[PDB]
Chains A and B, each alone.
Chain A
Amino acid sequence: MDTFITRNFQTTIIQKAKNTMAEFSEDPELQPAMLFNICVHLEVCYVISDMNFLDEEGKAYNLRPQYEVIEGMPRTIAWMVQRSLAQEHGIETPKYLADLFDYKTKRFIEVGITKGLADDYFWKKKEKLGNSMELMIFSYNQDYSLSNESSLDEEGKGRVLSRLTELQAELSLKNLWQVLIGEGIDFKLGQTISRLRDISVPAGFSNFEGMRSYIDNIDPKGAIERNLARMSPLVSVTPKKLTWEDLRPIGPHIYNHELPEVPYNAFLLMSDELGLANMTEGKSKKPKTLAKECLEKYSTLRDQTDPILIMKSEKANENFLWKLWRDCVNTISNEEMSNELQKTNYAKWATGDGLTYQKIMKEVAIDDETMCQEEPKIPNKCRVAAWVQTEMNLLSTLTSKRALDLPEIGPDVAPVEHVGSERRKYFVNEINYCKASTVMMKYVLFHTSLLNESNASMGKYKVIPITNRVVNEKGESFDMLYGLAVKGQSHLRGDTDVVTVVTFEFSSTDPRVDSGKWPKYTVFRIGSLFVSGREKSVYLYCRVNGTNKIQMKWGMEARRCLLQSMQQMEAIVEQESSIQGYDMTKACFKGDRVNSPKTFSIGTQEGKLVKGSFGKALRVIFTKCLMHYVFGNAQLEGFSAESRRLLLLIQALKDRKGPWVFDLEGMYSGIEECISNNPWVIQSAYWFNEWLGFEKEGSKV
């Protein structure tokens, strides 16, 4: 195979043929028959050209040859050589690339190898090319076909004819002729396609023939400058030098106290969460059994049958929600093995599933004059809410509980592996016990279980516990129950369709200490808890939400926030190391002799900048990623995509790189159109304004 090509042909021809193939890069290794064909073609061309020499005037013996090989070298130079030859000699340049040029007749020639019989491939080539090339064809079986007589003579023909003998004998001897070694197109346009081509020409042309003649006959030199002097001066970029005083705060309306405060709208409680803990031995349990045992450990909360309503949403029915909660509790507490709710008819109306508009045939709908398209729901415009800042503060702190136990990997022997291992160790020692870690794991587990029970259950209205598995420093393992959800079943199974999930989450937070945060939640009081001899009330936050399979998968993949935060950490460390020549992980965490541990600006206290360790910065990065994920929507995506430009402009200002802008108000409007009701977007706008004020202050000095 390849050994045959290596032995039968010299290396230069083989590599030139390989380059010619790579020019037609499809798969230069899968098809070796065409490799053989090309190498044989190049061998024939060389045999033709490597002895037939010429002289200055007419002597067909200095150093000038009568043949120029235009094969085996890249097409970019081959076409230029062909054009130069045609221009110098004044002969028509062929529309196909030539395999060789003969100097005595100063014309391009074509060569080919025919397996079957000569004078047949010759005529096929004549049909292909016509009267632009002189065709010489050599066949595997002794035969030849030429278009003239003053070309290569018998002595040259003998070498080429005998060269094929070895190949044809060895291929047959090696049983490689009946399976390989077996080697112009006419395309016509009809009438409708021709008409479409005729009517698809730019303005000023009648048919496609006129456009074709135009494009390839006129010289367009000077057209761009001709038109630019004709265009209106009003077509301009209007550049302006950016300054610090040009960077006004984004989204001023978030400071208007007449607007409502952003309500909490995440799927699950993050910092107000209260998980009932049941100490276990780490053995894996079914969600229903875990929930049952957790509720048994707290019988007073489980057996609370009367509702003490604390807060109610405007359109929420407290009786429906309480009966749904009791149905979930009774279903999880029973001795059966199914999580389907017992009262399905009641659950149909309690969840609001029965209040769905019925579809009708389009004929009556068209006839009915009272059926109109619904107006889109414009998002409300709200102001800054302190609960977002409180969530940021609380979720970045270290707790006594960790929810991440990743498997092992192989030993590190390469230096890059050691660098990665130390970075990973310092990351885990800082993020393991962060509250955001446990919250992220709770979200991921909830969405995993939500999608798992979204199969062809055909049972509808199941109950899904909101659980987690956690461990502390001492190594003890706890199963935490954060509440229960009831998931409905949509028979319309497309994985983009809303299924209703009614969540009942435990909390120790009084909803009345922050009324503007809980307008979507119906909150009851279900009992009290003693954790360290101190009594804390236990409230049940009930809310009807909706989700589809794609959001369930998105929530499941929310675990990639860990990878995102660690990639950000690695980017920071690598940026620090680029200035230096070594790894700055130790310097960035523990500090070496030449550099003290690095401190980062974390936040403000009474308007004064506060600094902290790299670990606090890493926890802040991780919780920022987690909030970006749990609060993600179109508004957050747009805000993140658009504020990057302002951030980079501010970076250019800081670096004294002399930034210029073409439409600052347009950029500001594009950024601000995304600040409607997303808590994260509004809080990030507030944070951006604060940081921009600090940067303005620091720029003066």
Chain B
Amino acid sequence: MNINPYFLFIDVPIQAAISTTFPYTGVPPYSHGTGTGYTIDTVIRTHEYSNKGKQYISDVTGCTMVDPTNGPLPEDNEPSAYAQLDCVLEALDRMDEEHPGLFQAASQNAMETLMVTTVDKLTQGRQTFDWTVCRNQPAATALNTTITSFRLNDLNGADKGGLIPFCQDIIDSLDRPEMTFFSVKNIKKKLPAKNRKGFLIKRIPMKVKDKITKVEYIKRALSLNTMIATAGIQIRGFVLVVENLAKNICENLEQSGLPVGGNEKKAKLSNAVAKMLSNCPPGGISMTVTGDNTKWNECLNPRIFLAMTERITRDSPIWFRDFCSIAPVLFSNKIARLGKGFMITSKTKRLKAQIPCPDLFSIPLERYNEETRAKLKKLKPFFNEEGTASLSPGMMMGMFNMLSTVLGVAALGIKNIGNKEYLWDGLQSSDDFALFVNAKDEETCMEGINDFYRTCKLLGINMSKKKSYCNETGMFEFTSMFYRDGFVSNFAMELPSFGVAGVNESADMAIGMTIIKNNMINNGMGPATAQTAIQLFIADYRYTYKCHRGDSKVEGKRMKIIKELWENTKGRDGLLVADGGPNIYNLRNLHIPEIVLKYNLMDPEYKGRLLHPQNPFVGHDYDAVSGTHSWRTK
């Protein structure tokens, strides 16, 4: 017999049999999506999807700018960025009509939160670009360096704490004729070597004071580095408020799928399906379209987002509209840093050298391979002689995920074209969408799908024909979730990793149990899977902290005395697992600290020793109970 795994689909529905195909949600080690070649490819694609628009030269930075908005309509089925402002405005006006007062309520909530927000909020993000050193650094250090440089430049806005004064100074810094800052330079310097020359050239991380010109600073502030791309600190302060606005709008839309609670997603999908089925005409047909979008980030224009923010904040004070108009404005003038460069090599001589981005065009293009040569030929018009390229159209990352979802839902809100015999609704999740169409025959559902496709083309949304399909309502997919006649499954699931949090024996247990509980609450982990995750975590915890059971036969450093602890204790059940005690965790008690879980079982003697008020170990998220196991490491 020859085993065929796919035969499992004969006896089981494919949605159930294909669940958790990928045991992870992050990029694997073999993810080829970084490098100068991929950044150049993104730039070329973004400018190809907008090459029929207006082209000019920036009066500020001097770069070459492309504008697909309000351009010619597409006459083909390739990705197009020629979104029409009138169509976007009509969609937004209809969205306002269906939800009276939503735009203004969202604007007021965002404004109030902005008024309350502090400078310290620009630390909860991820790795951010740093213009002072021109490198990707954590948000905290980048913010601190920017604050210090601004103090050096006589821009003291963060001293007031508020985020608005900091942003005001960050906008004023663009007007300074020169910017002085502190830079980190690996400084090679003298040292009394033991050699005859007595010169041991070596580097230290020295801090020096440098100064740049207004144009260079402006280009640096508009630059996105390669981690994929990451933005600087001059844009996060404005991006916060625009994202907050979009989240306020999106959490009041029934089409915008934002039920991040695990079971809330199942409820959302079931409710959408039931609502569409109940609204179908008698004798008609309802059809669901599982859709994907091609080049979603490469075809959305920051100009359209600026118009979107202008429309949303219509009834707001001019100061808040000006504040909200900055992030899309800085994203319409962005500059892409292309990365390390390209590796050139001589095989006969066995030599290799890295050509940096500034020197990309310093060698003849015949010394590049065919793909790189064509990429450079197309990149040349948009190349700056400093290692950066101009990227006016498109986006790069999830910097405007919520606003993209708002635009998608506005597209879904039309529901009909030309008073035809079909009604469409659906769910949008920021580049993922499902479209339900109710009509009286399948041929009219297809007409509705075609009309939706064209309407999306009018807004800059390009739906993937190669990755989109449709069938009768009752079975579809949305955000890696398969729905079929009620049953819901997940295509991917981030299973717990092997390891420990890395704090203590007391904090690690709570952290791991919390991860398991959150996995089975938000990711739909089953009972048996959660119990086995507990087992695996306990095994890894014991192996890492060398705290195997006291009744076991395992030799080691701590175990020799763990055995004595086990033998000297009568209530051996109340011992912590870090002391060789049994593991009493299960699904029900996954949210309770183990110390308080075993308190009533702890021996009075062991209870006293473990929880000594002034033990020499503790000194002075995850549920914590102070004890000898909450120690610290050098």
Contact = CB atoms under 8 A, between A and B. Distances in A.
Question: In the complex, is A directly touching B at CB under 8 Å?
Answer: yes
Given A568-B19, A572-B12, A603-B7, A221 B417 contact: no
B159 to A, nearest CB: 16
B10 A420 contact: no
A196 B60 contact: yes
Interface string B61-98: 00001010111011111000000111101110100000
Interface string A421-462: 101100100000000000000000000000000000000000
B532 A562 contact: yes
B2 A359 contact: no
Contact of A283 (B454, B469, B555): B555
Nearest to B323: A187
A60 interface: no
Contacts of B268: none
Size class of the contact patch on chain B: 35 or more
B260 interface: no
Contacts of A695: 9-10
A359 B302 CA distance: 42
B367 A373 contact: yes
Interface in A598-618: 598-605, 609-610, 617
Nearest to B453: A237
Contact of A76 (B86, B102, B214, B450): B102
A216 interface: yes
B368 A358 contact: no
Interface stretch (B24-32, B141-149, B607-615, B622-630): B24-32
List 9 A-B pairs, minimum CB-CB distance, nearest first. Answer: A420-B527, A365-B353, A666-B466, A75-B105, A223-B86, A570-B526, A202-B69, A691-B6, A575-B16
B67 A203 contact: yes
A225 B454 CA distance: 10
Interface stretch (B166-174, B225-233, B425-433): B166-174
Interface in A101-119: none
20 contacts: A75-B109, A187-B164, A190-B172, A192-B175, A199-B333, A203-B67, A235-B457, A239-B470, A355-B350, A357-B351, A359-B352, A372-B346, A496-B29, A575-B13, A604-B1, A610-B1, A617-B8, A632-B30, A690-B4, A690-B6
Contacts of B8: 600-601, 617, 620-621
A203 B53 contact: yes
Given A427-B528, A688-B6, A361 B353 contact: yes
Contacts of B218: 192
Given A416-B527, A659-B471, A200 B487 contact: no
A557 interface: yes
B278 interface: no
B465 A557 contact: no
Interface residues of A, number: 177
Interface in B1-52: 1-24, 28-32
B632 to A, nearest CB: 23
Nearest to A191: B175
A472 B21 CA distance: 31
Contact of B529 (A239, A370, A566): A566
A603 B1 CA distance: 6
A561 B536 CA distance: 12
Contacts of A365: 344, 351, 353, 355
Nearest to B73: A231
A243 to B, nearest CB: 13
A75 B101 CA distance: 8
Contact of B23 (A211, A364, A564, A663): A564
Given A24-B109, A223-B87, A644-B18, A667 B466 contact: yes
B491 A644 contact: yes
The listed residue with most B CB atoms (<10 A of its CB), out of A76, A237, A427, A559, is A237
Given A191-B175, A605-B2, A409 B344 contact: no
A409 B586 contact: yes
B442 interface: yes
B220 to A, nearest CB: 13
A359 B353 contact: yes
Contacts of A575: 12-13, 15-16, 487, 489
A228 B420 CA distance: 14
A625 B326 CA distance: 48
Contact of A371 (B171, B326, B351): B351
Contacts of A556: 498
A219 B92 CA distance: 11
B531 interface: yes
The listed residue with most B CB atoms (<10 A of its CB), out of A211, A396, A648, is A648
B446 A232 contact: no
A373 B317 contact: no
B378 interface: no
